[PDB]
């Protein structure tokens, strides 16, 4: 229910106009931080494995349902579809698109 985009390493580059209502953070508060700053302790290891897959394969990866820490330090449940796009001249990731469904 909201889109974000990230660097290859997970740094937030963009959140859409719907994100702040869901997660609390304004763009200026979250852009430039890693997605690893927000995952719940019990989900982060599995999410790192999803991120490793996204970096290696040029297909969509769907995460488990995980908990994401909002600005008020409570958690919401999300499920994300991630996909990375590589520059064909350098093999570096331009960005990862994230479709973040909210429960």
Which features characterize this protein?
monomer, 103 residues, alpha+beta, Beta-Lactamase, six-stranded antiparallel beta sheet, 21% helix, 36% strand, globular
Report on the architecture of this protein.
This is Protein cycle. Keywords: Biological rhythms, DNA-binding, Nucleus, Repeat, Transcription, Transcription regulation. It comes from Drosophila melanogaster (Fruit fly). Its main location: nucleus. It is found in: Nucleus. By secondary structure, this protein is an alpha+beta fold. It has a single domain, classed as Beta-Lactamase (2-Layer Sandwich), CATH 3.30.450. Helices cover 21% and strands 36% of the residues. Strands 1, 2, 3, 4, 5 and 6 form a 6-stranded antiparallel β-sheet that branches. The longest helix is centred in the middle third of the chain and has 13 residues. The protein is globular.
Number of helices: 3
User: Separation of termini?
Assistant: 9 Å
Name of the top-level CATH class: Alpha Beta
How many E-type strands?
6
Structural class: alpha+beta
Q: What is the CATH architecture descriptor?
A: 2-Layer Sandwich
Into which percentage range does the β-strand content fall? 35-45%
Note the overall shape: globular
The fourth-level CATH homologous superfamily is PAS domain
Major β-sheet profile: 6 strands, antiparallel
The number of domains: 1
Helix percentage range? 10-25%
Q: H/E element string?
A: EEHHHEEEE
Which value, in Å, is the CA radius of gyration? 13 Å
Organism: Drosophila melanogaster
Protein name: Protein cycle
Subunit structure: Efficient DNA binding requires dimerization with another bHLH protein. Forms a heterodimer with Clock in order to activate PER and TIM transcription.
Domain PAC: 63-103
